[PDB]
Paper text:
RepB is the rolling-circle replication (RCR) initiator protein encoded by the 5541-bp promiscuous plasmid pMV158, originally isolated from Streptococcus agalactiae and involved in antibiotic resistance spread. It provides both an endonuclease function that constitutes the first step of RCR, and a strand-transfer activity that, together with the endonuclease activity, catalyses the replication termination step1. RepB is a 24 kDa polypeptide that purified and crystallised as a hexamer. The DNA-binding capability as well as the nuclease and strand-transfer activities of RepB reside in its N-terminal origin binding domain (OBD), which belongs to the replication (Rep) class of the HUH endonuclease superfamily.
Author numbering:
A (entry chain C), B (entry chain B), E (entry chain B), F (entry chain C): 3 to 203
C (entry chain A), D (entry chain A): 3 to 42, 53 to 203
């Protein structure tokens, strides 16, 4: 059958032990658990809210079979805990989808939840799953350049500060400016020398 | 088998979900999708136009196997969505080939489509994937040198400014000067120190 | 073909010279040898630390020639050193969960000054995490050079997870980037 | 397994599509194609310039898929580009010495803006020769920066074998070393 | 087969020209030649000492094949000079083993020879071929840091001087500090800038 | 049979065309030809000088058989030109041996000739055959350090100058200092900064 690392599935509060949150920790795999979903618009007649459930993002350590994860949770939480496991094609999406903040979920105007009710098991960090491919770097690098040139930023700090305010405007966060100007260090020096000399005239 | 970043393949409107354009977005990979191909001269007897189809240009983030992308789309859009995935040798061509405006496609006098019906998923920008073959770089580098020497440009800025005006004259745009002087950083420093010392006398 | 520093493999008392423990020493590479495994045929687990990235098969041969072609038939690349080492006494997480026979830490044979504390580096994704931290730090407290940063570390290290030899391991190669940060701070302190 | 930029191979008119000349263009790599060789079976010699170091077999496949598996069966790595190019018209030194039939330079098919003048670099041992020269020069005439050196080159280039784009090709990567030389000269001019 | 830099092999006085010691010099490779081995305990019945022989430690300049060195010596000294060439895994050991002072040789209580009868051809210096395994470097590097920090050494010289006096205390000799701070150049600059700024306050 | 790149052999003025020096050039291989040997002490009774001859150092472009070179010269210069071809084990030696300035030739107190009468065919340069193996570099590097430290040389020039005078004392020539401090650029900077600061106090 098929194998993969990224899975997702549903957990209903009614069908799971009261210590599930700890029982899942025991698997030693990283997971992300949605805030509780208790506000999903039910197209069912005479009912506003779908039964309450949790979405679980589950990250095997090695390529395995969907059914291997099915069993592993049935044994952990009882056979009535889950009945449907799916392979995650894109992790970033399925994760935003936890709070209905993914592109598909906003376009279907679904109820938005709170990022803070998200339960991170086993040091799960979404970023250790979001890579910034080559071409994306150099794009932004040129941006950082247009920026340092435009606003005559004279050092790594002034740039950082500028980012702190207008970050979202150009798509930039601090740890991204750090990831971007990685290794381009020398080039950066050139840009600040430039700006600094220019501010002088 | 083989691994690579650049792929292409075919999508038939009849075999794909009505939300495919969004489903592909979910993969978080950049793609370029042809205008609809509904005008391809069919050498089949009794038929003017090949079945209607879409060409998809697909840019993995990391070298992967053709079959890995086959599966990924079969699961996304249904096993009847594609049956043939190919490795793209030249991105620039296979992209022009989307509107039958590539050299091969003009020489086979194939129906030309409209550039504007091209669907760009995930901030795909063709300019990202065309890059200066080696010899091209060093040519221009020598140019940037003739330039910094000739006009006594004393820093990355003055050079940039000069480029802003006389760019086309020498073939240079800003993001090209950036692509060119990549890694030659050190060498650049030498040139500016030169110019700056020289302006002083 | 793959190259790496960390390997492991099996040695059977029946198939090895009676002076193997010394013969391995001769390779001048650091190794850790399990207590004898006789409670799982009796065998030894060997943790082997090349000095330079090499091929699994290069180590296969090197031991076949050293101890005889019947000494080992399977060499593996070690992904995590800390684990594969605990696994020597079946005290690794995987080995406790499979309730395997636990051995004695003291029967472990350390060849060529092998010290487990040594081969613990930061996996990639860990370095850059901390690097960003060192940045948030140098930015926040306007540290103007490698020293002021060091000092700051000396006091509030544990707060941010940093020790001196970690700051050193972290800012490895990021040298240039660091220069940018101090120039920054120093200019900023001036205004 | 070996990687390189420069390859050559054979194409037989009998085994290739009638649009091959265009099909090769599609690869977006620069090539030089011999006039037809029918005076030595009739064949074409192809000079092929990968954009990045790759494996001979990677190019084998790439052409088998492009032109059909019967198009080529032998791909070779080009050691010297200038020669293998002259060898297209049997005007290379080896080909004149074996008195082989000479063809016409004009029947040569240049795909994708291939220009022979482009792929002539300095072999290793040649660079460092000249580098030492640039050093003897910067030392001798106390040139105090990349400019003064450039200027000097502009006048006495031919004397030492140097042109500007060669000084650029030479001092490639030796950047740092160059800095040392100018600091030197500049300090020395001061005394 | 295999390529490597470090080899060893045997030379019998009976089978070699009387000018061998000079003939080997001619190869322009560094070698170390054992004192004469004429005292090796022979397990052969009726004989105390193995035939007399020399051990040769041979250091190619570039990775080559064992057989390439076999030939090279057969041609130099005659085909009856050597019949067995081996790749040296550890140079430091195989060198001590020249005087039977290696760990293996002491444990097998073999006859110990004199260090002074060792013939060094072509400026062979054992210290050249013993080198700090990775972890060893970085240990000492941190030391050099603790040092430059502790005593506020403001440049490569002051550090050097300090080493000249208190070397042994920290395990450091000059050519070791040089071997250690190899490539860490940049990092070193940071440390001196630090110290120097700090001395100012 | 055996194959190799480096050969040597003898040419007698009496047995060779008067245009030999040009005929050899025609082979397009690099060679080095001794000054004329007309002063070799003949152990023959009643004769001071061996018949006059030339030594030829010959560098095939590809591994070939000694006999292949035998023929190639017999056809070029006539079958009476040479009767003995040998494989060169060490090029540097066999070349010094051209003027009897090799170690073996000095030890046999043989007549020394003039380096300038050496005939270099086809751009033969002995150095393109003399490599400086790793350990040799770093040895000398430490030397350059002991030197820059000792004499407080404050820049690449002062070092160069010092080399010009005391070169041979430490084994150093200019193009060797250049080959040595290759890539160690940064480290060098450290040394000059050091010296320069130190001269100030
Ligand atoms: Ba219940
Ligand atoms: Ba309702
Ligand atoms: Ba990341
Ligand atoms: Ba992304
Ligand atoms: Ba903010
Ligand atoms: Ba349908
Ligand atoms: Ba571009
Ligand atoms: Ba404009
Ligand atoms: Ba050791
Ligand atoms: Ba092009
Ligand atoms: Ba004898
Ligand atoms: Ba040493
Ligand atoms: Ba002392
Ligand atoms: Ba005659
Ligand atoms: Ba006599
Ligand atoms: Ba050389
Ligand atoms: Ba040498
Ligand atoms: Ba002199
Ligand atoms: Cl960096
Ligand atoms: Cl760069
Ligand atoms: Cl570093
Ligand atoms: Cl460069
Ligand atoms: Cl260095
Ligand atoms: Cl350099
Ligand atoms: Mn939901
Ligand atoms: Mn089509
Ligand atoms: Mn076991
Ligand atoms: Mn031909
Ligand atoms: Mn012995
Ligand atoms: Mn002679």
């Amino acid at each position: 059958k098929e194998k993969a690392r990224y899975f997702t599935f549903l957990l209903y509060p009614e069908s799971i032990p009261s210590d599930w949150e700890l029982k899942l920790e025991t698997l030693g795999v990283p997971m992300a658990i949605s805030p509780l979903h208790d506000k999903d618009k039910s197209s069912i007649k005479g009912q506003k809210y779908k039964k309450a459930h949790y979405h679980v993002l589950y990250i095997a350590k090695n390529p395995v079979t969907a059914d291997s994860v099915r069993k592993k949770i049935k044994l952990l939480l009882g056979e009535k805990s889950l009945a449907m496991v799916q392979v995650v094609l894109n992790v970033e999406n399925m994760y935003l989808y936890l709070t209905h903040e993914s592109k598909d979920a906003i376009a279907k105007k679904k109820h938005v939840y709170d990022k803070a009710d998200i339960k991170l098991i086993n040091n799960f960090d979404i970023d250790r799953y979001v890579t910034l491919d080559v071409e994306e770097k150099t794009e932004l690098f040129n941006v950082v350049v247009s920026l340092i040139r435009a606003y005559t930023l004279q050092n790594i700090f002034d740039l950082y500060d500028f980012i702190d305010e207008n970050g979202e405007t150009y798509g930039l966060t601090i740890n991204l400016v750090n990831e971007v100007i990685a290794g381009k260090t020398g080039f950066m020096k050139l840009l600040f020398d430039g700006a600094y000399q220019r501010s002088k005239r």
